[PDB]
């Protein structure tokens, strides 16, 4: 590559992977999202939150993407694995599902970095922690903010039809 | 001092005393608002009622302050005691707490207004009417009307969820 | 915590002595404000600069509380220690004063970034450096700016005097 | 009188004297003035100060009279007597002489408040705590401000101006 400055192989191949991970997210909240639009289950705020967050986990993928051309690495992309449910439970029951996701999401993302010190790859440090890092932990904070709630809230019909009336 | 004229020691020092009340309570209803931002509390409503309060208790103090130097009286600092409790329960507990708070800088600031009229120091007494003894008897019918709502409301959770949606 | 995630112990106790120097340096800007608006220093931008200060030394600590929220750590108040003068002396003491505290300060700053380093925390690494890091080089260069000039200046109450109407 | 209520011989009394005092400092403040656009003198921004200062307690007098009359007592005018000097003297010199001044009108407001207490007049308390007390307190801490600035640039010549040029 005649742009390619300091961006190991290692690094190439782990965004690779965070790019599949993202993806797989995505997918993940298309699941979540189109579960809650069910006649059945009928939540549309919480159908609206899960829409919302795959369209950002498929942007998220999208940046790593642009950056892995940036620095002169080459995409490469695997199958989607489909989501780990077919059926997602309550409000509550997704809510832990999608934290227990965004903490993996986070996770690949800290070990990333820590593959970039490792490297001396000051670029992908700074790219992680302008987009990814913060984004990640206010997600996260959120999610678990919903939880408390959701939780506080379980005459389990009533609470969840008012947390997704009067929060969502 | 130039510009000193009937204002006594006493007022002076009780100046003093009040201003630090009123930073001991803002640091006080800083400690609330963040326990009520906590992810395992999450009732942003309380969270910005108290930290609206926090705001209105500094600037109480820094009036305060005004006043004594255009008095002629000197400032003078001490430490701020830490708030009194690490953790704040239930919505209902802080609101509990806060109308303990309110009343005791309530007190001082009728014991203050007192010896002023002992002092014979109108301009004392004049300041205090304006800009503290009507919005402290306004702020404490205001938590006695949320404790009111908030002990209907006790399905306990269900109750503080809709209490911070729905009033705050 | 449910969302708690590669933020160690010590970090979080660090954030939270951080949050105490931080309300520290407020109550020390309060008390410099207040002292040049005394009438018998009367140094109107003196005041102004010091009272502006202690505003953004307060919104520094709520910055550090909401991050210690996001991270899942638990934010602890301790008593604030009182200023360490009563009466601070000319503009330029003051000076002086202000920029041994933006030091010490700074100083913490450090230690905490390389604390969050030696825990591989690279989201606290990202936070310091956004909001704090170049906030305090750029405060502390203007104060090395304001000593320069107010000790150019020292006929002494001239200088004072200008210093406060020109630059102030 | 048919309106008349609650309204001493005394308080009335008290109340021509004040208005007598009122238009004795606005007849000082005049000479003040005019001293300071003498070609010889020539300091522009201090005669703008005190020739404001003279439609001020003009201004005072009137709204006593006004007040008078509100009240059902009858207004009786006295002879003016002159300033106490034909010259002013430095900058300084007159805002000495003027702050004396405020002292003294303050002095007499004090008294009469005590007054209208003895009297039970609460209607003249309030009259005088929302027009003047404060006014008052603010006039002459604004003064302590100046004669401290005026001091410290005491080269005598060079200071006179800059204050005249910097500040008023």
């Given at each position: ?8 192989t ?99 993302l ?51 039809y ?7």
């Amino acid at each position: 590559s005649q742009i390619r400055q300091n961006y190991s192989t290692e690094v190439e191949a782990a965004v690779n992977r965070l790019v599949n991970l993202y993806l797989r997210a995505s997918y993940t909240y298309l699941s979540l999202g189109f579960y809650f639009d069910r006649d059945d289950v009928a939540l549309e705020g919480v159908c609206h939150f899960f829409r919302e967050l795959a369209e950002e986990k498929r942007e998220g993928a999208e940046r790593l993407l642009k950056m892995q051309n940036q620095r002169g690495g080459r995409a490469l992309f695997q199958d989607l694995q489909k989501p780990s449910q077919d059926e997602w439970g309550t409000t509550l029951d997704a809510m832990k599902a999608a934290i227990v996701l965004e903490k993996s999401l986070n996770q690949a993302l800290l070990d990333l970095h820590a593959l970039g010190s490792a490297q001396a790859d000051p670029h992908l440090c700074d790219f992680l922690e302008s987009h990814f890092l913060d984004e990640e932990v206010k997600l996260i904070k959120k999610m678990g903010d919903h939880l408390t709630n959701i939780q506080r809230l379980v005459q389990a019909g009533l609470g969840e039809y008012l947390f997704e009336r009067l929060t969502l």
